[PDB]
Amino acid sequence: DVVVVGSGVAGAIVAHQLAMAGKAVILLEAGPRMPRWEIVERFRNQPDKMDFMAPYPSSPWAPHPEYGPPNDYLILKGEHKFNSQYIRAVGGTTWHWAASAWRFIPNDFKMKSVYGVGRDWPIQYDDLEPYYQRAEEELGVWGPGPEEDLYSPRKQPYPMPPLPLSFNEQTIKTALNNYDPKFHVVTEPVARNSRPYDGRPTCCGNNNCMPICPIGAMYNGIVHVEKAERAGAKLIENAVVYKLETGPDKRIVAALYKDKTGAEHRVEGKYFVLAANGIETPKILLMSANRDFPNGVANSSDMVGRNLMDHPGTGVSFYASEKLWPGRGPQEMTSLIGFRDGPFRATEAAKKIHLSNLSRIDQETQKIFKAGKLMKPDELDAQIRDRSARYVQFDCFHEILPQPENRIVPSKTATDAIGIPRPEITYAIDDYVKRGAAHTREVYATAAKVLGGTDVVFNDEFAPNNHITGSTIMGADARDSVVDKDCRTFDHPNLFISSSATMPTVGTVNVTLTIAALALRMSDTLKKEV
Amino acid sequence: TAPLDTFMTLSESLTGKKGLSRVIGERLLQALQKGSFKTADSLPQLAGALASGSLTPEQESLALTILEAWYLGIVDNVVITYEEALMFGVVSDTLVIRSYCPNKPGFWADKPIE
Ligand SMILES: *Cc1cc2c(cc1C)nc1c(=O)[nH]c(=O)nc-1n2C[C@H](O)[C@H](O)[C@H](O)COP(=O)(O)OP(=O)(O)OC[C@H]1O[C@@H](n2cnc3c(N)ncnc32)[C@H](O)[C@@H]1O
Ligand code: F3S
């Protein structure tokens, strides 16, 4: 009936919707089923608790990127590393996310028209709103009410209100908004429970959201996998897909997948949804070149794997003069959103900026022992407490504009343990981002000044942020674009792509709520095809 | 007086904490032995120099290494323990150990009391 490929959120929502409307479903997950208690124990037993991939092993047959230390799965060329993370396992990469759950703002959808750069969406905010709201309700998202304007106009209030801000984050909101109300520091919307919700407990302040909440007080992809399964979808773990076959009638006829042995298998149904992620999905597509489609399925555009995007990151850290004590409650409760929009967006990149509320005991204890100076236990404790108390760090997402030379292709040369080719990402970061970043570095310096900042360190190397978007871009017309404004493939009237791959613009904020929205949209549209 | 005995009394002096666990102490010892404490004279010599007089940079640096292990709970990028790592007890009044709830919940709006 429907084969869905990818058991993350993008694809589990879809699977759950349809198997609810009775129409029988098959969900293929490359990775294995690993339960929460195991991820947790793996975390407790990892030596660098700042490595958010570390408690998620790459299966030989369905590997994913690692960097503590490198496993080399991705082939990175170009001028910059696309060292984003993701997880291959039942439930997908939102095992390990922060559950930041934003909406894009209206102008984000009309970037060339309005700002004369990048590239419009076909649909616009209006069209997405009611799906945002449904996504918020399905994920369980809390957020502020009318006392704070998040610049994406709402029909309903948030399903939940925030838990109170930590001292750290409220004090800094108050101080920063008092220096410059332009900054508009606000409480951040997040897929996390301020009360018992859809059967999940309220948030307790494990301060471990990356890389696992132990109790599921925040949303994880697994929630809708389990939903889909009770609603009668068939989960097949360790089924890693490497080809879709195109049938005579131009549609999609089957998906081919290797198990953990390298042995090959074949799955048929009526409709096909790729919700692999923004890398593995292009990869499957081009692995699938064949007689009638010499350029790889859905790629009459030449745009598949292309347009690849993520939020080039940039940071500051210092010791504040006031005590603040990061590490209490969630790792992020707040954001500084006053530069998501502006005329400047024609010249240079917009950002969201966010203060970290991560515990820094380890970090700052480690630091002190590096100074190579024996202390009386009392000095040592005094200092651990003080340093851990006063550390502050800001990071940020910059927008990067969709660019066709930024792309992922399946390696001609390199391969994995079961004989599937490997992602080869070319990627560069141009002056649009870099001029945005120069302004950010000034906000940072000002934040430091305001907060009595000491030992200020600027982090000017662009970090990844795991927001993998572009690679099957969304279009009006089917040749500079892969999917219509419904995430139907232009080339295959029975293939949809549920992923941030589809998003032509990456905007200023975490992309996953938008995905959840598109997923529900798609699932409506598909519910109509008997 | 075996190596453990000396280790344990050493660590007490260095950490200032009474009632350090010998079960964990054993494990830290054995991991530290992989590639520290060249001799068998090191531990005793460290105790005497510490207890009374004063330390070579090298001796200082051994003491640090011992301290490092108790406070971080890790030795050569292996976790010996997580809960009982001492840095957490130094801030247990205010900060949680990541992945462990406070026994009563949403506490964190307060400014901590010094
Ligand atoms: C790493 C990370 C990511 C992250 C984050 C923090 C961290 C540390 N914080 C986020 C946040 O605050 N807000 C947000 O919106 N996103 C955040 N992210 C990224 C987020 O996890 C992703 O955007 C999200 O997971 C995307 O959802 P999607 O379902 O599209 O992708 P996925 O969760 O990676 O799931 C993909 C599944 O498909 C399977 N797969 C892949 N290839 C294949 C093949 N060939 N065959 C079969 N299955 C396949 C994967 O196994 C995976 O389960
Ligand atoms: S990991 Fe879990 S309970 Fe609260 S702050 Fe983070 S969600």
Residue numbers in the entry:
A (entry chain B): 10 to 539
B (entry chain A): 52 to 165
What does the paper say about this structure?
In the crystal, two pairs of BcGDHγα complexes were observed in the asymmetric unit. Therefore, the observed γαγ′α′ heterotetramer in the crystal structure is an artifact of crystallization. FAD is surrounded by part of the long loop between Ala98 and Ser109, α1, α15, β2 and β6. Since continuous electron density was observed between FAD and His105 in the α-subunit of BcGDHγα [Fig. 2(b)], a covalent bond was deemed to form between FAD and His105 in the α-subunit of BcGDH. The simulated-annealing OMIT maps of sulfur ions in the iron–sulfur cluster and the disulfide bond indicated that this iron–sulfur cluster is a 3Fe–4S cluster coordinated by Cys212, Cys218 and Cys222 of the α-subunit. A neighboring cysteine, Cys213, in the α-subunit forms a disulfide bond with Cys152 of the γ-subunit. The unique cysteine cluster of BcGDHγα contributes to the formation of the 3Fe–4S cluster for electron transfer and the disulfide bond for stabilization of the structure of the γα complex. The γ-subunit tightly binds the α-subunit and forms a stable heterodimer. The distance between N5 of FAD and the 3Fe–4S cluster is about 12–13 Å, which is an adequate distance for electron transfer. The catalytic pair in BcGDH is likely to be His/Asn, represented by His476 and Asn519, and corresponds to His689 and Asn732 in cellobiose dehydro­genase.
Our research group has been studying a representative FAD-dependent dehydrogenase complex (FADGDH) derived from Burkholderia cepacia SM4 (BcGDH). Owing to the presence of the β-subunit, BcGDH is capable of transferring electrons directly to an electrode, making it an ideal molecule for glucose sensors and applications in a variety of biomedical devices. In this study, we determined the X-ray structure of BcGDHγα, consisting of the BcGDH catalytic subunit complexed with the small (hitchhiker) subunit. The structure of BcGDHγα revealed a conserved GMC oxidoreductase-type scaffold and a His/Asn catalytic pair, with a unique structure of the 3Fe–4S cluster, which serves as the electron acceptor of FAD and simultaneously serves as the electron donor for electron transfer of the multiheme c subunit.
